[PDB]
Amino acid sequence: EAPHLVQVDAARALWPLRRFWRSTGFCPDPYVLSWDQQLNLAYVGAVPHRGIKQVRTHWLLELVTTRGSLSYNFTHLDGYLDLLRENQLLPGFELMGSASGHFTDFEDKQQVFEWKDLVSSLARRYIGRYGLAHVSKWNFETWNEPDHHDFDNVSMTMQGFLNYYDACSEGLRAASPALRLGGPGDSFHTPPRSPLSWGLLRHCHDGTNFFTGEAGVRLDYISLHRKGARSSISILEQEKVVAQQIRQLFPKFADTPIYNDEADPLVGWSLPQPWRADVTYAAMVVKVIAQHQNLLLANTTSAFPYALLSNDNAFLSYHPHPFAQRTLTARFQVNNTRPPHVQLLRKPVLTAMGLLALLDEEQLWAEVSQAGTVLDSNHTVGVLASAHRPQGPADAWRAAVLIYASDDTRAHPNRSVAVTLRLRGVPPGPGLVYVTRYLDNGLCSPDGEWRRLGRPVFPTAEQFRRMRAAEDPVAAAPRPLPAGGRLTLRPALRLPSLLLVHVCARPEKPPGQVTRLRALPLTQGQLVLVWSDEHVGSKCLWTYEIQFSQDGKAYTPVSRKPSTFNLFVFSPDTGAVSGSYRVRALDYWARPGPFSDPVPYLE
C-alpha cells in the first residue's frame, strides 16, 4: 500500500459505539461437558471486559432426557449452563433437539403441546437457578437453519415449524414475558428459496397463533446467517439487501432487531485454511466489525436495526489441523502422556477480541486518507476510534484507537503500509500516558512458531511454552503524552496487522480486586489459572501479577510476559505447582489492585 494518513479527533465524539460483536458459537458424557470444552470456555471467558458474552450453542435439548410418556431430566443441561455461568458467559439458547428421541413430529397436536410444556419447565428451572434478571439477558432462538433441514429423526414441515415456533413462544411466555425469542436463524434467499424463513416472518406478522387463535405472533428479533465467501464487505452487502426486503414486505417489522449470528468469512468451519490459523483471520474479523460500525450503524440514511454480529468460532479443532480451522483456540490432544491430556492455544483471532474489548462507549471522529483521497472501511486500511468519559474514581478518561491492515483472506508476507497516525484533541487530565499494542504474523503467530518447531504433533512442555510466547501482542511500556493532547506516530504495518493505541488519564484510585480465581489441572507439573475482571474497574491495565506460595503462606512473584488476558497457563521448569496462588491487577502507573482471594492447588 501507498502511505496512509489516519487522523483521530479525540475532541470530537460523534455517537454511541455499541459492542454488538461480543458473540461466538459452536455445534457439538456429552461433548459439551468434556475437559476440552471446559478449557475452551475458560479461554472464551478470559477475554477481558466481557469481550465475548454470548455462546450460541446447537443441540442444547439433546442434553435433556425424557421419563414416562411425562417428566424431564436436566442434569446434562444443568452441567453445561453451570459451565457457562462459571465463565460469566450467556447461552445463545437455540431451542434445538428432540429431548433424547421423544420429539418426532410437530404436526402431532399432542407433541406441540408437550413441547410448550418442556420450554416453560426449562425456562422456569433456570430462572430459578440463576434468577429472572440473568435469564432475561439470554437470546432464545428457533432451531438452527430450518431451510437446511437438519432435524434428527424429527419431522419438520412448513406447518410443523410454525406450530413448533408457537410452542416455543407460548412456552417462554408462560415462564415470563421478559424472556426474549427470535429466529429463524437462516439465510433468507430470494423466494421461492428459504420458505421456512419467509414463512416464519409472514406467520409472525399475519399468521394464526396455534394455542390462542389470535392474529400475529411474538418475534423479538430476526436472526439471519450471511457468510462472505472470503469477502468482508460482502457480508454487510448481503445483510442490507435482506434487511431492505424485510422492511418493504413487513411494515410491523420496521424496528425489529436483526442479528447475523453466523457472520463468518467462509462456510465450513472444519475446512483447513492457512489464513484461519493466524493474524489474517484476526484482522479480517476486526475489518468486518469496523465496516458494520462505520458503513451501517454510524449516522446512516438506511438506519437498519442491526443489533448483533456473531463469529461462529467456538468449535474445537482436530488432528491434523490444530490451527487451520475456524476456531478461537488451537487444540492439542497430547496422547503420549500418562494419562493423555488436552492443551489449548490462544489464536490471534481470540487475542483480537481482547483488543476490540478495549473500545469504549463513544465513537470518535476519524479519517483515513491516501494522498488526499478519503477512504472508508471498504478498504485495506481502516480504523475504529473510541472514547470513555470518567464515571467513578476507579476510572478516568480513555481513548482507544484500533487500526487494521487487512486484505481479507489474503496474507502478503512482503507487503507493508506506511501509516502516519495523527491524534489530536485529547482533553486535559492527570498523568496522561499512551500504550501501543501490535499484532502480525511475524511476531504474534503461535502457528508460525509451531511450524518453526517442525509442526510437532505432540509438542513437548518447552514447545508449548515457546508457542504460548507468541499469543500476546507486542506492547510498548506506557509513555507520557506530550502537552496539548496530541501525538504523531509513524508505524509500519504489515498485511495483515492490528495496532491498538490506548490513551489514558490516571484514575484517582488504583484498580479493584481480581475475583473468581480458579485453578484447572492440565497435566503433571502444569495448570491453568483463570480469573474474572468484573470488579477491576478500569481498562488501563498493563498486566496481572501472579504470586505463588509453597512454604506456609509467604507469596512470591511468578515472572511472566505482561498480559491482560484473564488466563495464564503455569508451566514451571521444575514442575512444582502444588501450593497457593493469588492474582492482582497492575495499571499503567505501576499501581497494584488488591490481591484476589487465594486459591489452593494440589496435584
Ligand SMILES: *[C@@H]1O[C@H](CO)[C@@H](O[C@@H]2O[C@H](CO)[C@@H](O[C@@H]3O[C@H](CO[C@H]4O[C@H](CO)[C@@H](O)[C@H](O)[C@@H]4O)[C@@H](O)[C@H](O[C@H]4O[C@H](CO)[C@@H](O)[C@H](O)[C@@H]4O)[C@@H]3O)[C@H](O)[C@H]2NC(C)=O)[C@H](O)[C@H]1NC(C)=O
Ligand atoms: C489423540 O487422541 C484423540 C482422541 O483422544 C484423537 O482425536 C480424534 O481425531 C480424529 C481425527 O484424527 C477425529 O475424527 C475426525 O472427526 C471429524 C468430525 O467427526 C464428526 O463428524 C462426522 C461427519 O461430519 C461424523 O461422521 C463423525 O461421527 C463425527 O460426528 C471428521 O470430519 C474427520 O474426518 C476426516 O478425517 C478422516 C481421517 O481421520 C477421513 O477419513 C475423512 O474423510 C475426513 O476427511 C475425522 O474423522 C476424532 O473425532 C477425534 N476424537 C476425539 C474423541 O476427539 C487424535 O486423533 C489423536 N491424535 C493422534 C495424532 O492420533
Ligand SMILES: *[C@@H]1O[C@H](CO)[C@@H](O)[C@H](O)[C@H]1NC(C)=O
Ligand atoms: C438424570 O440422569 C443422570 C445420568 O445422566 C442420573 O445420574 C440422574 O440420577 C438422573 N436424575 C433423575 C432425577 O433421575
Ligand SMILES: *[C@@H]1O[C@H](CO)[C@@H](O)[C@H](O)[C@H]1NC(C)=O
Ligand atoms: C466496496 O468496494 C467495491 C469496489 O471495490 C464496490 O463495488 C462496493 O460497492 C463497495 N461496497 C460498499 C458497501 O461500500
Ligand SMILES: [Cl-]
Ligand atoms: Cl471463516
